[PDB]
């Protein structure tokens, strides 16, 4: 067991930083004089084009691919790195990668090749999104006798007809609400969308995935596909996740991801597995910012008294369990994308382990947040400290990609429940 | 022991709740409007000229001195029925009550008589302010050896002269930046302001406190006192607290609110301790109207599935933790307040009952204002609820009025360490 | 709103803390030596006859009633003195307590005055018990669907034939295995044990309650009553709550407490709401203790450094947080306390502002015993000190009297579902 | 970054594994019988016989001085099995690791080769005691200003004297209270014991440790060295860690460890930070069984309901939340034992990264003992469930090895303080 870094994880590092430090700190300028999220999210645009220039949008997608994504931990270090700094453009980089994943999951190299070639390029600001959140909400999505997915599709000839409305998924408009470049529609198939799921069966059955495109929304009518609204965010103020509704409409049948079913559903389970152990790495930046800043402040401020703060037990018990907080989620990180990476390891082990992370560094970075504050005390409340917006983003975190109380604990409960569990097999292997 | 209201404790409810729903519930549509704090501040000045007029500014005096205050416990019911509603103006209140704090509780009747006045009228839109926060702390403000506070006073003939940087207090420069009507504020004594404090003397013999009003502003040359800047909170997006610089402003002094030293700590200590278990008040306030917004979402919404989710177990553990919190808040709120209204107790007994209150309460404010969000999901996080605003209203709580780390644990610590400490002389008697 | 005692408040507190002072503390000489449960509970008699020479037995009975008792808050107090000194005993006077609380609460005048006689007396140790629990488990037993309790009843002529078993119930083979003074089992009523519950009955209107003493076991076949086992515990080492399967056992029906149906699960769950309360202060003297112990060290330790260790910031960080515990604690007892006593409030507001108390108040004592024991550091584990005591004796209070995880959370939750729960009705009044 | 176990770790596993199985579960049997904390402990000594026989103390020592330890991760692999069964022997082994490391440590050979020699040849049973805590506390041990250690010693000749009093340190009596194998008595240097430790120096630079065999016990007085008493443990009740007094207690010069000040305290410093790494691994062990037992009853248990209890959301979010502090547990204790192990690093980051593991993981597994109780409800509180005994074990990891409060997070919050912090240091290397 080993944790040392090779010289490319960090160089991913240096150049993730330098990145952060020299281009997303000019965001803040650009978009603070903005008054609505679609403006704020429509300035940081120039940002994500260095960003795809600097080859972090090719850094999403796998070598195999054609992309220039090194490893899973890699990813991490950056991802951490970003969130740290700033994460305006950092959200629509990792959206634009949960976007990508079911396509770059799938089996199909003629499908990745077409749609995956404006990611790998290098050029423009191609935006990807995954598109499964609903307005009604979707922590029931699976639930056998529920309502299921309120989005559904229906066959009509060689086409696709989707009915039913998308809330956060980020991106999901592009810059401009004619589209992301590549949308992942989540669907629930239904012949009748006025008739309600049928009871007697699984969900996950019916469960199929629509490419969309900006030729798509551009080949259908103006009202059947509309932004009806852009919700105002507590944080991550910069990011666009609309209200979409599909009225009747039309996809090509070439555009399905996969034939519908169960192979359509691990698909969308996979990708937020992934997704589920990676936001750990934003949730540690987040946090990381707000303890760096506190350690700093508590070591070169008496607050009136004759030492320095941290020389207080109750302010350096604070900066501890801060710094415990983000040790422990950072090698939580690690362990559960390099699990994921590992080809002798079932599915469920690898699933256990990132609904774990998830809900671990997630739950704990909020924590941290707030004892870093409360450390720094009065001064952390005013807007000259980073520590207001590091409040509201860090709360992002254990709602969002599945929060934790209705999806990723019930995910891991299901996978805790099995009669074939096995506990520390991501450990010390399968019995 | 008894926990039931009387007929004017459930009229002071109905009261704050009338005036919350029918005034306080108009502010937002002004002052969201604005483009910094001061104008945030003063978008507000309407909804203050309203609650004078509604006599919640006279509430804050006690009935003696030409108030209407009936009790502690009121002043409780009132704070949470308002700041479960609006925190805006609700906020500009409980700062002039503080502001008030001082001179209401010296016993100089000539004193009170005169600066009490504006307060009691029912008239125009009268503030007041407890100026003791700084721009570098003052939490170790006390602490024999160390620095003490930087804006100090001195003698000089008949008048003293402040020299120093107030930041923070609540109204202290008024709707215009002329001055708040009243405030009163705390200094170190210095004859020479570049001489450190002396190590070998107590802090607490050198406080004084000097009142100040928009005649002693008025009264100075335009430089001696100036407004530096006014922080942009994360919350409370709409109260005034600015950056005030003092340079030899000179003050009457028969503005001095008592002798300098242990009284006139003292008197700052007894405000501090009062404020101290009414922000928890706020702080319940806050809390339950994000446990009330999540309650009525989880006993009318499925989230896509077949039942409300408030059936989920994990749904249901987050809401009974948050009535928890509250249930226990109130009650130690109404046992701090009810424990400083009783003659019978020694100041340590009721200061240790205090400090406890804010620490609980502004604590576990904040963990019930998240539980709340976790358990209404991913809806919480956008602003057609309302929870965006209390996360960062509730964060202000165990960070003001004396943080809970610095200033008010290290209080109840120091009672806790003296040798006649009796730790249930408030429940069990002395 | 007033928290002043009257004088006689003040005197029951100071007549339980004589009581335990110089009776109680002499208890532990006589059942240490003992070699198992039923020894040490045996060694414990002397003990328990005095507590009812003191009254206190007597004043677990309300007035009206015959007995002493003057309030809930008297009796509030009374538990968090002895508590706060000896459990053992103790413990006997609160099962007593609760296995008389049935028939305390029915409304027949002549079943009262029969049964409650021998505890009114001031002589001998009458022992009372209810026996609820199972082998099985309880947390389920209104689950409809579910199998319900094993226990069962059903009439034959004109008696009643128990069938089942119990388990945990303190008092409840009395001080020889020959049966409580007066214990009341609660059974399921069914005419064929050897078949499952109807999955189409509320299993609440099946519920019967059937007093059974000394007598009753004499009258029946020695082994149609049988002490199968007595549990060993971590704490309340003394205590006995043994398991007791009875084979058609036979019970006069003069012995019904009421027609079986919801009034029978109406008293059982008054019963242990009234207990629900009262179990906090149980849980504040063990706690209480703890502090206590930990605060007189803090202050006259140095633990080899200079100044007394509450002058640490982390060790008063500690103490502070153990005596916030304690004393919302016994706020919320106080006021449940009240809140059960109020005749102006709905049975549901009580039975939450009960539950309420019973998992705050039993959580939050095991965090405050663990930290007065970092507190106080390595000498808090030996047992010259009462923290090992106090660490096994708090962590049944979250377990017993309806554990916090299966019952009172799922009671609480159940209430604050209903369509015109008011949460603070009991504040505020109703609306 | 790699977390695969080798052949030789999957085989260390295996067999601590076997013998926990094997031999540790036989223990109970016979310490469950005697009287008192030394009768446990020499009814232990069969099974401690057999852990040299299966070369488990000559494992503690590394492979250049002749032992067989292969790494700080096998010997954290090893401690968990072992201390998941039973932690009876498993502490002996342990504290005789413990006092083995300075000498371990020490700049000196030939100290190495005559002092370790019994540990390494696989025979008998030799103790070993790091013997460094006091009956009057050790958190401010290092105090300028403060009375000091209170076991001095001062030079007569060519011998050492030692006067003073130890309390705590396992294993120093021996199996007969004639002294361990070897014991590091840890001494401050002070001409004349009566005078006060003077506030002038360094307490570091007054630091001597002195190796004490039974040898030089056998050539003192009977009353040079005398046993006070055996404190009665809440848990690990099979320990020794005796009252210890050393009046005019003659040791040669030769066995002096080290020169006496900053390079003997290092010593005592890097070996209780190799520990402070170490006990979490025992720590795990303990909440692992108790999570372990936990599970597998949620799992089978219907609790007289329709479903196993691990299907209410309530429980199953006790679990998660018990896995997720052993596998962040886990995680931080190979990094910190791999952090030791690694020569490029700044003795300050061992340290911090050493301090958070204590920390952590020990602070975390009382929390996962007490949520396994909460989850598996009355039933853990009887003996007939392990849970008893694990909540007494857990509760010393907080409180032992240099105490979390007064202790690790004082050298942590130093460490942190210093103008030359790195917190990432041992995680992306040094700037
Ligand atoms: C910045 C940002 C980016 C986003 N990006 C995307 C994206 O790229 N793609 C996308 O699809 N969405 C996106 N979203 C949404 C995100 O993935 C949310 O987690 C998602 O909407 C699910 O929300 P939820 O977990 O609250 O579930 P909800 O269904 O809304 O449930 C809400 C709450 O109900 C309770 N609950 C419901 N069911 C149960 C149950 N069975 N058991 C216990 N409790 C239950 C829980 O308390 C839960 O938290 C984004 C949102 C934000 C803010
Ligand atoms: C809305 C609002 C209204 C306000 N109104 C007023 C007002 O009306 N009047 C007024 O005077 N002020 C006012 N303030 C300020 C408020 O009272 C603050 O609590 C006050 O500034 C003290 O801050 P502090 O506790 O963080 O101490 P600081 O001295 O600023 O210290 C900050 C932090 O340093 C650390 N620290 C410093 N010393 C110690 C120590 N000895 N031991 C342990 N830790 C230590 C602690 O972690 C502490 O949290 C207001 C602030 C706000 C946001
Ligand atoms: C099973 C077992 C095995 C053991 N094995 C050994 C061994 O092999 N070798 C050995 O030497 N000892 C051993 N001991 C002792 C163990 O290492 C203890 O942790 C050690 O005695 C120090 O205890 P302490 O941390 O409570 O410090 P103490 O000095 O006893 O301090 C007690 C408490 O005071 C407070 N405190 C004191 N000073 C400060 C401060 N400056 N700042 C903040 N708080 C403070 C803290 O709350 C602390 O917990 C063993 C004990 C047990 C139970
Ligand atoms: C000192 C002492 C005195 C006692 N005195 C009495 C007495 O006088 N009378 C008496 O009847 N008993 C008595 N008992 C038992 C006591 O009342 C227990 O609380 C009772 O047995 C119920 O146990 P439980 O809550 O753990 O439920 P169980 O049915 O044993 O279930 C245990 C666990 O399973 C899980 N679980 C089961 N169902 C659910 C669900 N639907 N939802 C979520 N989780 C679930 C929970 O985690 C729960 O903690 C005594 C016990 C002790 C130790
Ligand atoms: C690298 C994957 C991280 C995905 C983060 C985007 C958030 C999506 N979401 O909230 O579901
Ligand atoms: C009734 C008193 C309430 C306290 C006023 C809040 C502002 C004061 N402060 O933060 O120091
Ligand atoms: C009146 C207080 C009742 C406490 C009885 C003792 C335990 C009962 N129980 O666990 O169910
Ligand atoms: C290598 C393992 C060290 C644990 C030693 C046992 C207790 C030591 N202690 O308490 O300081």
């Given at each position: 067991v080993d944790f040392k870094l090779s010289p490319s994880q960090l160089e991913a590092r240096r150049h993730a930083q330098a990145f952060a430090n020299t281009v997303?700190?000019?965001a803040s300028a650009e978009y603070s004089?903005?008054?609505d999220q679609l403006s704020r999210f429509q300035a940081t645009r120039p940002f994500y084009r260095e960003a795809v220039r600097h080859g972090l949008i090719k850094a999403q997608v796998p070598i195999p691919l054609g992309?220039?994504?090194?490893s899973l931990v890699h990813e991490s270090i950056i991802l951490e790195e970003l969130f740290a700094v700033e994460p305006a453009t950092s959200i629509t980089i990792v959206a634009t990668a949960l976007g990508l994943m079911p396509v770059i999951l799938c089996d199909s190299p003629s499908l990745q090749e077409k749609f995956l070639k404006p990611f790998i390029?290098?050029?423009?600001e191609p935006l990807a999104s995954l598109m499964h959140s609903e307005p009604n909400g979707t922590?029931?999505?699976?639930?056998?006798?529920g309502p299921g997915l309120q989005t559904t599709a229906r066959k009509v000839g060689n086409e696709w007809v989707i009915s039913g409305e998308k809330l956060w998924?980020?991106?999901?408009?592009?810059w401009d609400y004619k589209?992301?470049?590549?949308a992942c529609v989540v669907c629930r198939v239904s012949d009748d969308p006025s008739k309600p799921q049928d009871?007697?069966?699984?969900?996950?059955?019916?469960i199929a995935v629509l490419l969309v495109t900006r030729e798509t929304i551009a080949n259908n009518?103006?009202?059947?596909?509309?932004?009806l609204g852009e919700p105002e965010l507590?944080?991550?103020?910069?990011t666009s996740g609309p209200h979409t509704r599909f009225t009747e409409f039309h996809v090509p049948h070439?555009?399905?991801?996969?034939?519908?079913?169960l192979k359509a559903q691990g698909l969308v389970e996979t990708a937020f597995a992934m997704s589920a152990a990676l936001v750990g790495a934003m949730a540690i930046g987040t946090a990381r910012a707000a303890f760096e800043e506190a350690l700093v402040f508590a070591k070169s401020d008496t607050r009136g008294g004759s030492?320095?703060?941290?020389?207080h037990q109750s302010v350096a018990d604070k900066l501890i369990d801060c710094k415990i907080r983000l040790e422990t989620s950072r090698l939580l990180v690690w362990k559960a994308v390099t699990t994921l990476e590992?080809?002798?390891?079932?599915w469920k082990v690898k699933l256990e382990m990132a609904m774990q992370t998830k809900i671990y560094t997630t739950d704990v970075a909020v924590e941290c947040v707030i004892d870093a504050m409360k450390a720094v005390?009065?001064?952390?409340?005013?807007?000259?400290?980073s520590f207001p917006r590091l409040l509201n983003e860090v709360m992002c975190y254990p709602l969002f990609?599945?929060?934790?109380?209705?999806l990723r604990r019930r995910q891991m409960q299901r996978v805790m429940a099995?009669?074939?569990?096995?506990?520390?097999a991501a450990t010390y292997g399968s019995s």
């Open positions: 997303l700190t000019k004089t903005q008054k992309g220039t994504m090194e390029s290098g050029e423009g922590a029931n999505w699976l639930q056998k006798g998924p980020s991106n999901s408009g592009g589209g992301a470049d590549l009871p007697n069966v699984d969900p996950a059955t019916q009518k103006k009202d059947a596909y509309q932004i507590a944080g991550h103020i910069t070439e555009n399905l991801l996969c034939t519908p079913g030492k320095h703060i941290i020389e590992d080809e002798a390891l079932e005390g009065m001064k952390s409340y005013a807007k000259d400290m990609n599945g929060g934790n109380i209705g099995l009669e074939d569990y096995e506990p520390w």
